[PDB]
Symmetry: C3
Subunit: 340 residues, 3 copies
């Protein structure tokens, strides 16, 4: 909500309270999304200040507050800062920002990250260029310096992040994306490569000294219709765990496919139909293994711009004999969202 706007500075304080619950059989250990209370809330700010007609400064922070913890010991479980960055936009020259933000490859994966509760399986956090990552300096250009309507690009510099965990770490790397949008149509290509850390290399699964990720996207966005498709691959970037051996590391290679079709009815109902499949190749020991594989049927109903509810249903296609131990059961999410 725009709670402030004076002297060229306007702050928008925003957030939401999400009553959320997952239904899956058993202890949801073997299901797709788990089972039980998954309620949570968000709070963040987006500020923008007009330094002059061409120059704009801005910043943004968003935090995630789990609503399913006890006020006991586990109280902080799941809590985190999702985004935190500041930057400047200058006329038709482009924008630049730095801090915790979205890796460039997400410029592609964004296309299909549209399901009501699930979806976007490949956009992992603290995983190089696919989801939010800390320490990214991002330059973005729109309409090619104002000379080409619809042509945009971005280059992104990832600063080394040596965390206590191979999964949450990264070396330096560069990434970039180009996309073009012409009347309801949009196409994107994004790519990034980075160094792996000593610890990432000390892991049992995956072999290499460089991590890679690229994805292409295609979309048709107009007339209440949203159809999107993504395809990408990765090298030693996708984190995987052998539930049997309790071994961990990164997939040597993956080929990912995401499809999403949705329609927005005038009365507020947005039915969704999607398909996701990510398969690892050359996993040391297993060979080829599916990591994600399912159909999605779901629907969101918007009471208005502040209230909505939805049922997301995962028809898991992974089979009970999956070598990594990836879960094979279905999961049904039901939620009620208020937001401002």
């Amino acid at each position: 909500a725009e709670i402030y706007n004076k002297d060229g500075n306007k702050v928008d304080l925003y957030g939401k309270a999400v009553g959320l619950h997952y239904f899956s059989k058993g202890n949801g250990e073997n299901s797709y999304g788990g089972n039980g209370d998954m309620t949570y809330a968000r709070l963040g700010f987006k500020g923008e200040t007009q330094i002059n007609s061409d120059l704009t400064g801005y910043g943004q922070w968003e935090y995630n507050f789990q609503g399913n913890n006890s006020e006991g010991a586990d109280a902080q479980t799941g809590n985190k800062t999702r985004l935190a960055f500041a930057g400047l936009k200058y006329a038709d020259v482009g924008s630049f920002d730095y801090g915790r933000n979205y890796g460039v490859v997400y410029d592609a994966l964004g296309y299909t990250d549209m399901l009501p509760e699930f979806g976007g399986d490949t956009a992992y956090s603290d995983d190089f260029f696919v989801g939010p990552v800390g320490g990214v300096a991002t330059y973005r250009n729109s309409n090619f310096f104002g000379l080409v309507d619809g042509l945009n690009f971005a280059v992104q510099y990832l600063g080394k992040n040596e965390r206590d965990t191979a999964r949450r770490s990264n070396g330096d790397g560069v990434g970039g994306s180009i996309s073009y949008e012409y009347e309801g149509f949009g196409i994107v290509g994004a790519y990034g490569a980075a160094d792996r850390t000593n610890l990432q290399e000390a892991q049992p699964l995956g072999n290499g000294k460089k991590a890679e990720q690229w994805a292409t996207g295609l979309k048709y966005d107009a007339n209440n219709i949203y159809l999107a498709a993504n395809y990408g691959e990765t090298r030693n970037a996708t984190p995987i765990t052998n539930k049997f051996t309790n071994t961990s590391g990164f997939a040597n290679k993956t080929q990912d496919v995401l499809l999403v079709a949705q329609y927005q009815f005038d009365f507020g109902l947005r039915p969704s139909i999607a398909y996701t499949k990510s398969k690892a190749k050359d996993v040391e020991g297993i060979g080829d293994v599916d990591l994600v594989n399912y159909f999605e049927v779901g629907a969101t109903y918007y009471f208005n711009k502040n209230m909505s509810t939805y049922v997301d249903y995962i028809i898991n296609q992974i089979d009970s004999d999956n070598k990594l131990g990836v879960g094979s059961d279905d999961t049904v999410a039901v939620g009620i969202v208020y937001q401002f």
Copy 2:
């Protein structure tokens, strides 16, 4: 404070900074409330959006920020999300919400949870239906579908919560309350029963496979006068700890009594007089033991609706020979509260 209100949506951002300090002798280990700095702050939001004349959506989140930690390692100690839920209200049909909220039995205990700093000893957190609990779906009806002024009820469904701790866990259960309010008078009856988890059953104290809690309340609220009384009992629900053996579990049974009398002077002074007593029965090994037992004298002075100060004084009646080791010393709380 109502920081936003446009297009049928109004957000109220609220909070407070509480400078608080406890005075009790010794290391306050043997006192009622402890001793020392207990300063803390709250921040939360309450949103409400009119979907149409009969339909209302809403959500609420509140967080607790301890103000007595070091910015060092212990920095997060005590911090937590207290409430987080979203829901809808429809004409005279009733409201429904889900998320972290107040158990239904609190509809009763609320009556006496009115002391300046202490009080409400039996409304424990993450303890089934008595205080805030995660995963509760709540239906509330007012004025009996609009057919009976003053008659309200609620039914509440508790979703199983399997935490690492028997104290912060719960199985599925149902609860309900009915209350009636007629001109300054109000009476309530609330009740809930739930399954106990394996871990709750693996505990040394308390024996059963079902937890119970019910409380009745009576009040007179009018003419600057507030008098309230509560009585309730519980079965295997009240958490207790043997400080000697360092044993823990739940009381097999408790009988709780709460009394509160207060008066609001025109100039801002609200003196308080209360009495609390909770006694456990059949505790494995000890027999009958008092858990809480004291008199309360306190006063709050309101400078206005945003500023106030108060002195709460506990005249602990527990005696030094209490078998569980419950503290016997007095505690005096002094506070200064700013809020918006």
Copy 3:
């Protein structure tokens, strides 16, 4: 930003998103400030309510959200409540507040805590009266009861804080400051002494049963010019660690000197030049050791009151043979700040 102001109560919700990065060679283990992503954000509130013409109530909370953590396990690292207190101001009688706030000696050290990213080396947190501390009751008088323009003082009572760590703990103590400001000039003298806890005394470094800290300040603040100087000493208060022995405790004695010169150009550029030096004396085993020692060259450029960027550069004078193991490398901070 002043998001609320009605009925004599005005709330100011404030904060900032700071994209920040440190450049230092090696793994920055041996540098002054470290190396890498240091992005973070702040969020806080300052409320003020006019109880009547002479009486004002107020409160303030500020939190620090690290923007360089993974949403993984380390997610909360660095997060903390910086300030949290409530109080009252009465006509020309003075103000009083309690909670987590700034120790009185900071009334002095504030003078030089003006560098773009570094500086203020001696104003340690949870370290008695020099930085923020929990449990402080503070009385402040301005213009000597309204009888002496420019003459102010404060007395501050520190409540014992027994934390799990000798570094984050403290016993009871009193502190006070007096300062005088006459047309661009200002002079301050501050002092505080407190009891040390058993644990603080159980430490390997430093010897005594009372902690002391005093600092004097001098400043010239006018005409786009800011020149400030501080000098102070301490007894068993300054925390130190022997990186070789991994031993810790407090310096028996320190003599601290801070100098800062800055100029604000009309177009937004504020160049900074500073010098800091803190040296420990009588450290058990080492003798005299420098703790901090460097020159600072830096500059801040204000695009406006909401946006700015800066480069802080530490020319570390500490030498590679420093007995405690204090780092000797340079550090360059670059930041981009949005704020409201």
